[PDB]
């Protein structure tokens, strides 16, 4: 059973966004992380789906994409983890990218 979360990692001037998949079993599974960026430049749609390795009760952060960091900018995410018996999805609150690393 895979588990999913949605993170945003702010670095100096740039926010790296990716969803944290905790996976209760070590091995490899498949999941789809999409990021939604909405700022003064418009709404951009990020989508990465595939498979990656996950460790049991370990956090596996998926879909690392780097945005230009703005605390007032809307950066959200959605990760669907669909792999055999597991199927789940999560969504980032863009108001959390406030200096969260």
UniProtKB/TrEMBL annotation:
Disulfide bonds listed in the record: 4-90
One protein family per Pfam: CsgH
Residue ranges annotated for the CsgH-like domain, each copy included: 2-90
Protein name: CsgH-like domain-containing protein
Species for this entry: Rhodopseudomonas palustris (strain DX-1)
């Amino acid at each position: 059973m895979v588990q999913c979360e949605v993170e945003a990692a702010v670095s100096g001037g740039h926010v790296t966004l990716q969803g944290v998949i905790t996976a209760v079993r070590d091995g490899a599974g498949s999941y789809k992380l999409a990021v939604d960026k909405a700022g003064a430049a418009g709404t951009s749609r990020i989508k990465q789906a595939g498979a990656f390795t996950a460790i049991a009760e370990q956090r596996v952060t998926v879909g690392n994409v780097v945005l230009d960091y703005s605390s007032a900018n809307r950066y959200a995410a959605r990760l669907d983890v669909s792999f055999g018996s597991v199927t789940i999805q999560c969504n980032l609150d863009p108001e959390t990218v406030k200096l969260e690393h």
